[PDB]
Ligand SMILES: C[C@@H](O)CN1CCN(CC(=O)O)CCN(CC(=O)O)CCN(CC(=O)O)CC1
């Protein structure tokens with residue numbers, strides 16, 4: 001599924017991302033835009049063999065099982081393919097574990113470079129929330 005901006009905001013708010021570990025909702029919408037273009041089916045291979053999956057491009061090195069990243073972990077306890085579904089439940093729940101692990105939202109490269117220090121409220125402006 002390719003989400004609209006306001007559609008995704010509403011979905012993310014319903015699963016409790018708004019102000020999760022102090023990160024306002026506009027930060028999450030901004031990350032998803034630049035990580036995946038709001039597309040749940042996005043995949044991207046990294047140079048060490050791992051792959052990033054879904055709307056927030058979660059990495060098979062630590063977080064999910066894709067059967068081909070040898071010596072990895074699966075700390076969200078899921079197949080990487082569940083992170084490509086039109087329902088974002090599994091992506092949101094896994095992301096809650098990542099952002100809590102000590103590095104905050106800096107784990108998402110595109111957030112650090114394109115969203116950090118900007119007017120992030122602009123990304124939910126106009127939405128009926
Ligand atoms: C809870 C998360 O920390 C899981 N974590 C993967 C688990 N392992 C081993 C472990 O963390 O016990 C990898 C070890 N490694 C450095 C280290 O921890 O020493 C990873 C660093 N990051 C995050 C961080 O530590 O900042 C990756 C996420």
Ligand SMILES: C[C@@H](O)CN1CCN(CC(=O)O)CCN(CC(=O)O)CCN(CC(=O)O)CC1
Nearest residue numbers: 062073075097098099100101102103104106107
């Ligand atoms: C093996 C190294 O990871 C040693 N580690 C010291 C041992 N402990 C806990 C533990 O690692 O079992 C520290 C707790 N902690 C992070 C965490 O573990 O969750 C501090 C951050 N760093 C590393 C990091 O995690 O990125 C300190 C280095």
Ligand SMILES: [Cl-]
Nearest residue numbers: 024025026121
């Ligand atoms: Cl915001």
Ligand SMILES: [Cl-]
Nearest residue numbers: 067068069070
């Ligand atoms: Cl694997």
Ligand SMILES: [Cl-]
Nearest residue numbers: 011086087088
């Ligand atoms: Cl959803």
Ligand SMILES: [Cl-]
Nearest residue numbers: 021103104105
């Ligand atoms: Cl933080």
Ligand SMILES: [Gd]
Nearest residue numbers: 062101102103
């Ligand atoms: Gd770690």
